[PDB]
Amino acid sequence: TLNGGITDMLTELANFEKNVSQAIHKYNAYRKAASVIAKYPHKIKSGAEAKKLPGVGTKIAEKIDEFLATGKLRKLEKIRQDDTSSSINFLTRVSGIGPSAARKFVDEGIKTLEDLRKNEDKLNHHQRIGLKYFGDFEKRIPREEMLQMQDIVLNEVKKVDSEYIATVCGSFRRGAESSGDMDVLLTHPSFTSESTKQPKLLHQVVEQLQKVHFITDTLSKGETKFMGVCQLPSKNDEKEYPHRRIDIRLIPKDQYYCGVLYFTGSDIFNKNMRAHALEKGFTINEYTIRPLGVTGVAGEPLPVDSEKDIFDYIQWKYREPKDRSE
DNA sequence: CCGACCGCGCATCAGC
DNA sequence: GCTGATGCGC
DNA sequence: GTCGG
Ligand SMILES: Nc1nc2c(ncn2[C@H]2C[C@H](O)[C@@H](COP(=O)(O)OP(=O)(O)[C@@H](F)P(=O)(O)O)O2)c(=O)[nH]1
Ligand SMILES: [Cl-]
Ligand SMILES: [Cl-]
Ligand SMILES: [Cl-]
Ligand SMILES: [Cl-]
Ligand SMILES: [Cl-]
Ligand SMILES: [Mg+2]
Ligand code: NA
Ligand code: NA
Ligand code: NA
Numbered sequence: 001t002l003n004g005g006i007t008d009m010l011t012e013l014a015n016f017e018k019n020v021s022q023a024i025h026k027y028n029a030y031r032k033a034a035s036v037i038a039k040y041p042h043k044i045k046s047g048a049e050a051k052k053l054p055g056v057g058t059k060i061a062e063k064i065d066e067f068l069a070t071g072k073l074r075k076l077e078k079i080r081q082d083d084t085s086s087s088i089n090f091l092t093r094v095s096g097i098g099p100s101a102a103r104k105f106v107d108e109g110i111k112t113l114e115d116l117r118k119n120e121d122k123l124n125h126h127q128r129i130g131l132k133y134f135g136d137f138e139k140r141i142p143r144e145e146m147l148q149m150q151d152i153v154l155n156e157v158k159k160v161d162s163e164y165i166a167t168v169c170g171s172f173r174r175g176a177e178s179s180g181d182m183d184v185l186l187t188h189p190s191f192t193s194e195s196t197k198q199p200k201l202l203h204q205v206v207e208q209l210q211k212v213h214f215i216t217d218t219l220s221k222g223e224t225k226f227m228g229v230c231q232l233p234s235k236n237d238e239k240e241y242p243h244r245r246i247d248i249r250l251i252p253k254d255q256y257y258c259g260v261l262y263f264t265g266s267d268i269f270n271k272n273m274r275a276h277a278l279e280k281g282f283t284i285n286e287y288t289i290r291p292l293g294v295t296g297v298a299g300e301p302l303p304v305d306s307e308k309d310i311f312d313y314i315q316w317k318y319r320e321p322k323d324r325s326e
Numbered sequence: 327c328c329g330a331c332c333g334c335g336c337a338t339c340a341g342c
Numbered sequence: 343g344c345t346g347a348t349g350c351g352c
Numbered sequence: 353g354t355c356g357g
Contacts (some may be wrong), residue, residue, distance in 0.1 A: 008342090017353090023353090023355075024331090025330090025331060026353055028331070029353035029354060030333085030353075032353090032354085033353085033354085050339095053356080054354085055353090055354065055355085056353095056354085057354045057355080058354090059353060059354085060353075060354085081333095092354090095350090095351080096349095096350070096351085097350090098349055098351085099350090100348085100349060100351050101349080101350085102348090124337075124338080125337090126336095126337080126351090137339050170352095181352095184352080220335085220336050220337065220350095220351090221335095221336080221352090221353090222335060222336050222337095223335095224335070224336095225334095225336070225352085226352075227335090227336080227352080231349085247351090248352060249335090249352080262333090262334095262352090263352085265352085266352075268334070270352095271331085271332055271333095272332095273332090274332040274333070275330095275331075275332065277332090278330095278332080281334085283332085283356095284332080284333085284350095285332080285333055285334070286333080286334075287334095313357060326352090328355100328356100329356100329357100330354105330355090330356100331352080331353100331354095331355095332353105333351090333352105334351105334352090335350105335351090335352085335357105336348105336350090336351095336352090337348100337349085338347105338348085338349080339345105339346100339347085339349100339353100340345105340346090340347085340348105341344105341345095341346095342343105342344085
């Protein structure tokens with residue numbers, strides 16, 4: 001919040017570029033500036049001061065000078081007044097509606113929540129559940145509720161098979177006092193990089209959580225990734241908890257550290273870390289870190305016995321999860 | 327300059 | 343049906 | 353939009 005004015009401006013510009021211009025690289029450029037500035041431990045006094053930071057260049061520097069002098073940005077003022085952009089930006093807030101679908105909807109004269117509700121027939125399944133819980137998915141989850149959700153998910157998984165390990169990642173693992181959703185990393189000994197010795201490993205867990213009415217809707221579901229919706233049980237006479245987004249990723253057990261590194265994020269931290277890896281001659285995904293040969297082709301998986309080994313390979317000092325919130 | 331910008335699972339589609 | 347490309351989201 | 357080579 002020290003430079004919250006500026007970082008908000010940049011995020012709004014990032015959202016415009018992604019959602020309206022469908023200019024993903026511009027979007028990442030703005031997100032990176034916002035992130036580098038959000039970290040900066042001083043109140044920024046000028047564009048020039050900002051430009052010293054990596055990811056802030058001439059254009060962003062100029063915008064920061066405008067914002068500092070006036071408290072706003074004319075380019076944004078105009079975007080906000082523009083009915084087509086505003087409509088498109090709005091629709092992309094429904095889970096399952098991206099920039100392409102949002103613009104297709106807007107072309108058909110579907111531009112508001114009212115329009116979406118009356119055209120459910122035009123929605124795929126994901127989009128439909130996104131609209132259903134539109135309000136709910138806007139709400140943050142207090143850590144206290146995440147703690148109760150953890151407890152249900154770990155206990156239910158334990159009931160299915162005591163050899164499962166379920167680990168809550170995302171901003172929760174980074175120590176955040178609230179989270180946008182719940183991310184669960186799942187492992188079982190019978191699923192490794194070498195073999196899948198049991199089928200339905202994810203499904204059974206999903207089933208048990210549906211059984212006890214924790215998981216209420218499914219956005220998508222494959223052998224290793226579940227994306228859907230869950231809700232804490234509420235007591236007699238009390239209002240229901242909001243429904244919440246839940247993702248569950250089943251990862252080969254021998255690839256736990258790469259998987260927990262990935263699912264811990266943040267997303268920007270993952271991008272930055274993977275890009276540094278490339279500079280160091282490695283590539284990192286949620287499974288492995290592999291060397292790039294002279295060609296630039298991934299070699300074989302390097303050995304990894306902790307998250308710190310991954311940091312070590314790319315010559316970064318270890319960062320605890322709570323310092324990875326970029 | 328100017329190329330590169332992280333890496334991937336699932337749903338949905340086109341084209342065979 | 344298949345594979346490959348694209349959208350979307352993590 | 354920003355950056356490194
Ligand atoms: N490589 C890579 N990894 C990505 C990306 N997006 C998400 N991830 C990873 C890290 C994130 O913590 C994790 C969960 O993705 P989330 O979108 O849940 O992110 P979180 O850190 O939990 C917070 F945004 P919150 O949910 O609290 O509001 O998934 C991406 O674009 N690239
Ligand atoms: Cl772009
Ligand atoms: Cl503004
Ligand atoms: Cl690993
Ligand atoms: Cl891999
Ligand atoms: Cl931590
Ligand atoms: Mg999350
Ligand atoms: Na800079
Ligand atoms: Na969306
Ligand atoms: Na998530």
